Design a protein around this nucleic acid. Sequence first.
RNA 1: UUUUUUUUUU
RNA 2: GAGGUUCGAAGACGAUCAGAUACCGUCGUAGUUCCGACCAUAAACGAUGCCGACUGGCGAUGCGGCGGCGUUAUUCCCAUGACCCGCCGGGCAGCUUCCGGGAAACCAAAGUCUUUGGGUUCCGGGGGGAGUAUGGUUGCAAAGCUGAAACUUAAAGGAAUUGA
Lengths: 222, 150, 83, 129, 214, 71, 97, 83, 24
Amino acid sequence: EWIPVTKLGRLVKDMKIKSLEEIYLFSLPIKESEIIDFFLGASLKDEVLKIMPVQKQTRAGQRTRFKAFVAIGDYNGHVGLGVKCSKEVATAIRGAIILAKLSIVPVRRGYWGNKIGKPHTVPCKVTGRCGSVLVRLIPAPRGTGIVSAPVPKKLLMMAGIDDCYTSARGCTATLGNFAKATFDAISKTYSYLTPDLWKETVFTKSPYQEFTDHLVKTHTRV
Amino acid sequence: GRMHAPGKGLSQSALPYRRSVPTWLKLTSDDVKEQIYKLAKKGLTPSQIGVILRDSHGVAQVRFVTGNKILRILKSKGLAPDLPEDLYHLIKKAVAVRKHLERNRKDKDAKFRLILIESRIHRLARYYKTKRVLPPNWKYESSTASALVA
Amino acid sequence: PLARDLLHPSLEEEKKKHKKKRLVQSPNSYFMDVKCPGCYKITTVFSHAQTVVLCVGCSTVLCQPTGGKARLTEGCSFRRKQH
Amino acid sequence: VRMNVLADALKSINNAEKRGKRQVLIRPCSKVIVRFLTVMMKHGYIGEFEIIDDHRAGKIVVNLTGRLNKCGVISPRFDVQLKDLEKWQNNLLPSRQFGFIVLTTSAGIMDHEEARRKHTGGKILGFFF
Amino acid sequence: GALDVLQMKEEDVLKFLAAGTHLGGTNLDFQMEQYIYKRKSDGIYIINLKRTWEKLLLAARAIVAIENPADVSVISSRNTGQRAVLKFAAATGATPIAGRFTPGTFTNQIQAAFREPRLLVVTDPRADHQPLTEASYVNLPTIALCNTDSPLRYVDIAIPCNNKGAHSVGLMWWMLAREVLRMRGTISREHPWEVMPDLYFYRDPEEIEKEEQA
Amino acid sequence: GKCRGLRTARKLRSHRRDQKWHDKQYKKAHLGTALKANPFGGASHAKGIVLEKVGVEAKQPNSAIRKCVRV
Amino acid sequence: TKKRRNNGRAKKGRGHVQPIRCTNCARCVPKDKAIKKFVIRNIVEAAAVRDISEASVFDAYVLPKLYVKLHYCVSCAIHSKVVRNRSREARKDRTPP
Amino acid sequence: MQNDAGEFVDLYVPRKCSASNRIIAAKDHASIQMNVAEVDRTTGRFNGQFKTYGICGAIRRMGESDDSILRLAKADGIVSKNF
Amino acid sequence: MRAKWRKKRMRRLKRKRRKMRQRS
RNA sequence: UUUUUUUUUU
RNA sequence: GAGGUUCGAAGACGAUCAGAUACCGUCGUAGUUCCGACCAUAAACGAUGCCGACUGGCGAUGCGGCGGCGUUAUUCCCAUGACCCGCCGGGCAGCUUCCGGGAAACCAAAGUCUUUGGGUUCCGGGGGGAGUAUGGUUGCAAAGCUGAAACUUAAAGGAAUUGA
Ligand SMILES: [Zn+2]
């Protein structure tokens, strides 16, 4: 019951794209939440963080608008966060989940010490900045859990990382800067140039050129 | 940068990579030493002995041509002055400052510069004390500075 | 320009730059042999001269240091030796 | 006026890669630095380099593959032993999967993994990853 | 293009000299210096014509690489390049935009003017700053007819040229059109193209009226 | 900037001790003046004699009359 | 914070400026910081020039002009109505037209 | 990327820029993947072969993409040696 | 308390204090 | 040409 | 200690108001001037330590050194001056700029800073009490330099958002 309105959206509906991983590869902007809903809708969970009733003071007075943070994650390998400020509590919450899903970014995972077993920690200790908040994720041995504030603890489990230690410098009481700074760090893990990424990337056909005749047929129909 | 000045100057001697004596130089080491001797008997500091040997005559580097430094050739013979030349002229300049100082006591720009130059001797003379260029009991004073110079 | 040839900078750029900061530091000065009108003797004057160079045979000055290169006289010709 | 020359070399190299260039121009050159670059050779964090013999402390030209994130110095040459060398790793290295802490062992300038195999510590000099 | 069948010819030299593609301007860009031979006595930096051919060919290779002509766009703000932009749009199938580039064409997916080209060619980054800035959010590769002072912000490939000159703009557009049509096989390389380059030239309204009346 | 040399540890201990006289917690405890000044004299409890019963007004926002005892 | 990068006056290089008295209130203010303008006013008002001209003996050869230097400090520059307050991007302007 | 058992354990493998050799961010929306078509030596017509050039958004955003492509194509032989 | 005239008052309280100690 | 103050948590 | 030309604390006189111990005007001592010894304070502000490496560019200014098509005066040649084009090193500097950092205002340093170490001095540790008390030392005085404690408070603060 969804109609695509863009190139990537059409490719998702007609099952010409296997998953989101190829999308991350080509750095193509995503502009539909139906892409994420179709792929991992049965394994994605969302949690609202804070709604502070912000307002303003003019010749009329105070009228509160609600702000909504929510991180969306499958608890396995994919998380992202989004914000939404509107006039109503429910409108902010719903839309923020759409944006959080829209801005989902790959979460790269690694091993600590022995490489046996499944990945549970970060590839390396990483930093992210938002305002004055500097969030540093530190690799942890297996079975420790998450050492962070309750909200980033939820964010790291939502991202799927099993064991973490976290150190934060700055005003972490500001939740938005706290989550956004750790997400910048998490987004820096896969962007971090590690030795196992030194292998030369074999360039693959972009989804546009790999599927061009189908793109033209659908666009002429629409 | 400079010791006592806020000058980030960049100008020194950029000696060439080729240490060899130029072929066109139709000069002998004995003649170079003889021209050094003629300048030495005249009473000239080696700083301008090398300068004269460079502008005229045609020597690029005395050290490159012969193999020993100008002060080393003079010191091996024994006619070199006991007081180092750089140490000497700073005392002369301070002497010049103090002559103007007693002529005009109101110049506080001169007083500051004199204090600056005095310590320029003091740090230099301490190093020369350690390297045995001058006796350890050698001291510099305003009263004996006039006797030191000339 | 991400990549510029540090190992082999161009001769035009190297001569354009300062005598320092080079691949191998070298003088911008040179040697050159003096012939003055009315005289046969050949003098040797190094570039950037700072002392009076008077010809013994001609009994006349050759170059007066006026800052920078020693501005020589009118009649004397210059021939830069050794490149 | 210049107290450390390896610290400058590692900083200027880091400053070049952050921009994204292909080569660096190191005004000084110490055998300590080149023994640091030979560890960079074996671990594959920069490419080959040459030394210009200008008779004045030498000059270094270094070719880069842009594979290095940060290279740093511990200017106080701290006396690291085998007991505390593991502590420097978890304090300095981004992860135990990669990265290297280099130190002037009495056996020569070596990375920390080679130090454990040789059972010899020394004075810490720097790190890279 | 290092191939001999793609090497330099003579009629192209005449066209470049007559249109004035090789003078550019006086303002020299630090990242554009490698495309300059030297400068005149008027500060006019003469653009090396070998570099204009090479970047034209390299640009042309990018254009022939796309398999859907309807998925390429052409944008013109200055009216001087609008006519050539339109002719190039009709000749190779590019989608034409003219006048004022409405905001949200590439980023806003809601309005009916939403376009998502796979390639865009740009007459001048200075006059087309808005499409290039909007190109920074859709990772859209662009080809720019760069001047000696054109701001190469969010540019991907640059062809040295004279965007100030009216005739220089139109000639280059026809020349890229001739190259891509030669390369794709629609127009043969063995014979000169039958359409005059003047179809790409924009003429002032007063001059157009005078010519029509006469 | 702060010193880093390997033979300045005495300077480190001195700079830390002479700057430790700058925080309200350390200097309050290690001068011996706070303990001589509080009526308790370092006492968590104390046996006193009830002298007077008084009523003290509350702070500005609260209009209350607390029941304090002078001991 | 700094409302003005210039800090009001034009003196960024030198340490001191000799003061000039304000015309409207007689208050000393540094010259470079004060609002100083050149005023050229005809001796006679444009409407009133004709009444004098009619009685004038001269064959239209006399046009005296009154030129007076004007100096207002900033407290009364506003009262004069000169230098009305500007917008946030407004400040960064110049002569005006 | 690989555990001690030899299995290839990862989610994906992002590309890189061919000049800066730096990982292109998954949400970097200014990074291009430009295709350069190739032609036969004699025919001069497109032969269905293209060469990819990955450029990270930042390098393009700073202004080094134009120089990086030229060096890469000349190295690959597309750009004439006598450039 | 303006900053300067609080300083003036503290000085004048100090001068009165000194005269009291001098007479005592 | 002037025009002071205004009340306690809620 | 020299003379007070002009200004001008203190002070006086005249206007303005309910009061005006002030702004306005007229005088006006000390002062504003020079000389010797004190006094050492300011928003002595770039409210922005010094030495050292790296770290975009564009149009300009000073000095010095280097190259030049030409214009112009000494003239009759070089040469000496002066304008224009650049290059090199030391500067006082804008201006733009997704270099970058910063809470932002704004800044190529207010960058290379958790991916934390080039050397080091001075200096800060919630707000008051308080630059106070006392001791010491300088000064003719006024005051300067050094400088607490008791006690008391949950905020004081910086930047930025829309109104008034
Ligand atoms: Zn006024």
